Structures are given as structure tokens and as C-alpha cells.
């Protein structure tokens, strides 16, 4: 099993003076950190959110981010002054940074940037570059951003070394929560007809849900999307379209790792 660690920053710039930056950090589908614009500090959302970093190593890393947030905010504002009137407020910037861990001691890091909701810029190798489809005017900010050797060196060290080391640590400290098994609970209902099988409370996310006449799997079954619950478990429903009157004989069967072979079966 491969985990993706994701630091997700969202920044809104309304005009020349108003601005807010918020971040969430994810390991797989679990939240590890929260950093609200309102807060001077980054909040742990798990007891193990510090990984295997000493208090000193953490205070130091946080301080670097604290300053980055202020730095980031002013740099965007100066960059808009360089482009104007070409580009104008309100502006949305999103960042998606982190690494994907692999078997052995292998990983892969990324730092993706989106402007007004379109993916345009990444850090690759030793420099910022625009991605295919990006507007040409971005070449000025790229050139400006790439003159900053100190930021380059830092980001390279953040992506090649810091991420993987830190995420390894999280994987150890959070093993208990990462490998938790939570049992689904299922129930049935209908609208006009259309039968609905509700599945809720399960973790992890791989789940099998099929409507069945006895032991023949109904072809018509339609799974919806995975919807989150507040307690970090999942919710899924599978609907089957039928002719009114033949609701008898049909069953909902659910397979999930937490059950340990005891499939859930429900009849209408």
C-alpha cells in the first residue's frame, strides 16, 4: 500500500490589500494538520501528527512556514503589480505539495500550483516551470521566481529530503490509525421504482456492494460516490432500478475487510 502525503494550500486575494491563506495536510485520506488563516501556528489533528521529529526540529520547521506564509502573501501581491493591468483581482492560488511513498525506501515528490483553478506551474528538478497549456504571461513570474536561488535550494531540500524523512516518521507513529478497520452498517429503502442500499461507517475505503436476486448478481446496480462521515469513515449507496411488484427476492450484499468474511446480506 502506497500513501500520498498532501499539503494543500488555498489562498484568496480579493483586492490590493485583502488576503487569506488556509491549509490542510492529508496522509492518505486522513487529516494530520490544520492551519487556519486565523492561527499563528499549525494545529495537529492527530496525536501522532508530529511524526518522529523532536520538539526542536518541529518548532524550527513551523517557524519556517510561519514566515513563508507572510512571504508568499507579499510576493503574490508584488507579482500582480508586475502583470497589471493584464491580470487583476480577485485571484485564487492553490498549492499541492508533498510526496508519495513506495515499497523499500523509494518516494516521489511534487509541488503543483494552480491559478484561478487551473494547473499552470510546478517545481521540477531545480527550478519553477510552467506546464503545457499555461498562458505565456506566466513566463515573467517564472523568470522572477527562478532568480531566487535561496528559495530554490530550500524547496529542493524540502522535496528531496524533508518530505520523505517526515512522512516515514508519520507512517510509524500513525500505524494504529492508518490500519484501523471499521465495520459498515447497511440499510434499505426505495423511491418511485428504485431500491437503495445504504452502506455507512466503514474504513478503509475499498468496499464491495452488489444487489442480488438470491445468488445472481444484478447487472443494473449503480454505485454512487464515496461520501465522508465526520468520524473519518465512509458512506456509499448502490441503487437498483426495478419494475414495481418484484421487490421480493432481491438482496443487498456487502463485502469489506472489517467483517472478516462475514458478508452483510439484507432482504427487502
Amino acid at each position, epitope marked *: 500500500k502506497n500513501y500520498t502525503f498532501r499539503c494543500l494550500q488555498m489562498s484568496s486575494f480579493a483586492n490590493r490589500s485583502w488576503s487569506r491563506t488556509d491549509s490542510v495536510v492529508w496522509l492518505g485520506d486522513l487529516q494530520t494538520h490544520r492551519w487556519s488563516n486565523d492561527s499563528a501556528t499549525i494545529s495537529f489533528t492527530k496525536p501522532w501528527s508530529q511524526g518522529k521529529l523532536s520538539n526542536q526540529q518541529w518548532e524550527k520547521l513551523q517557524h519556517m512556514f510561519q514566515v513563508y506564509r507572510v512571504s508568499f502573501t507579499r*510576493d503574490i501581491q508584488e507579482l500582480v*503589480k*508586475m502583470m497589471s493591468p493584464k491580470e487583476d483581482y480577485p485571484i485564487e492560488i492553490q498549492l499541492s505539495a508533498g510526496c508519495e511513498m513506495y515499497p523499500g525506501n523509494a518516494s516521489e515528490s511534487f509541488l503543483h500550483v494552480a491559478f484561478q483553478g487551473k494547473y499552470v506551474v510546478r517545481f521540477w528538478g531545480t527550478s519553477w516551470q510552467t506546464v503545457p497549456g499555461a498562458p505565456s504571461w506566466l513566463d515573467l513570474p517564472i*523568470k*522572477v*521566481l527562478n*532568480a*531566487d*536561488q535561496g*528559495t530554490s535550494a530550500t524547496v529542493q531540500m524540502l522535496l528531496n529530503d524533508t518530505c520523505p524523512l517526515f512522512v516515514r516518521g508519520l507512517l510509524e507513529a500513525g500505524k494504529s490509525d492508518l490500519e484501523k478497520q471499521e465495520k459498515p452498517v447497511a440499510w434499505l429503502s426505495s423511491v418511485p421504482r428504485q431500491l437503495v442500499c445504504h452502506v455507512s461507517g466503514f474504513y478503509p475505503k475499498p468496499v464491495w456492494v452488489m444487489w442480488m436476486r438470491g445468488d445472481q448478481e444484478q447487472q443494473g446496480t449503480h454505485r454512487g460516490d464515496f461520501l465522508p462521515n465526520a468520524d473519518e469513515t465512509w458512506y456509499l449507496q448502490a441503487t437498483l432500478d426495478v419494475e414495481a411488484g418484484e421487490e421480493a427476492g432481491l438482496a443487498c450484499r456487502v463485502k469489506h475487510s472489517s467483517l472478516g468474511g462475514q458478508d452483510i446480506i439484507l432482504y427487502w
Partner: T-cell receptor
Amino acid sequence: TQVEQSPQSLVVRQGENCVLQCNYSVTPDNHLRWFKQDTGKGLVSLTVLVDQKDKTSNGRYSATLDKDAKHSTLHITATLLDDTATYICVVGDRGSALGRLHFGAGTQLIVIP
Amino acid sequence: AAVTQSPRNKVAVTGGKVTLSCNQTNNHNNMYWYRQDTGHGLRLIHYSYGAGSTEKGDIPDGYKASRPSQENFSLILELATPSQTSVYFCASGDEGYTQYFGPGTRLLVLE
């Protein structure tokens, strides 16, 4: 303010060495520059220090920077009369044009011939 | 890489109109105006990121800037006042961090 220099002024006999201090709170601190300004003239750059712990030299001028302490010194060896001037400390908060320079008010040096 | 300023020195009256000019041929995008008064470091008045625009620095009040072209950045004092007595420095630069300073302009504004 964010950049403090000391001493405010000093008087030195030709041939004596002296040392000028600059302490700052600027964040971040990408690089530190020392200028020399003759009375009435303009700003001649002496050196620029850019590393966490750095040392530079330029003729009879040498300089140290410590980013941990946010402290820099400028050493003049064997002062000449031409060294009579204002020495100015300037910190840049970026490694590019997105930055702002933060100027100290300077240290006034007089060399007695 | 050279920067020039004119006039180099100017006497003017309160209510008068003063224009300080800066010229730079290095093909630099960026230009900056500062004033230097004793007991203070240089302070940023106005700056410019390219031919055609101008931005407020830290002490913009009493000054208007104008960037008509890549080579020229000028600082306009519409209604000159004694407190604008000072030495003024212009600078240019590319995308890197070094600024290149002009020689300076002494301005005295008498009542």
C-alpha cells in the same frame, strides 16, 4: 527600526584598525550589503554577504555575517584618510526583485591624518 | 551598469513644481526612488516594474511618479514644501536582487 548600526560615529587615527556593527530584525534575511558614502557623493558597494555564516574581504575591508544572530561586522584594517565617510548597512529580504532593501542609518567614521 | 540623475542639485520655492529625472540604459525593468535624510536610512518613495506603471513605496505622500518609458523614471513634486528638502537617489535593476544607484540629487525648498 529593523536595522541598527553601531557605533553612531567614531574618530580614529590613520593606521588604526576599526570595526563597525550592524544588528537587524528583518525577516527573512536573504543578503546583507555594506555601502560606503563620501560626504556629498553617493553609494559605493563594498561587499555582499549571502550565506548562513559568511566571510568576505575587499582590499583592506573585511566582513562577517551571522544569520542566526542577525549580526554583521565590517572591519577596516589600517585606516587611510580616504576612509572618512558614512558606512551603511543594508539588508535584503529576498533573493530577487520581489524584495525590499532595509537601510540602516549608518556609522560616521573620521580618520585623523 | 550606469544610472544618471538630473538635475544634480536644485533650489526651489514652496508651491513650485519640481521634476527629478532618472535615466538608465541597462534595459532594466525596475526603477526606484528614495530620499535620504540624516538620522534615517534611505526610504522608498515610489517604484516601477515596467515602462507604463508606477507603485507606491513606503512614503509616497507629496510625490507623484511617472514611468513613460523603459529608460526613464521621474519623480514629480506638484506643490513643493520645505519638508521635501533632501537628497534623492534613483536606482534600477533586473529580476535579481542588486539595485544600482544613481549619484543623487540635492533639493532645497525655500519658503
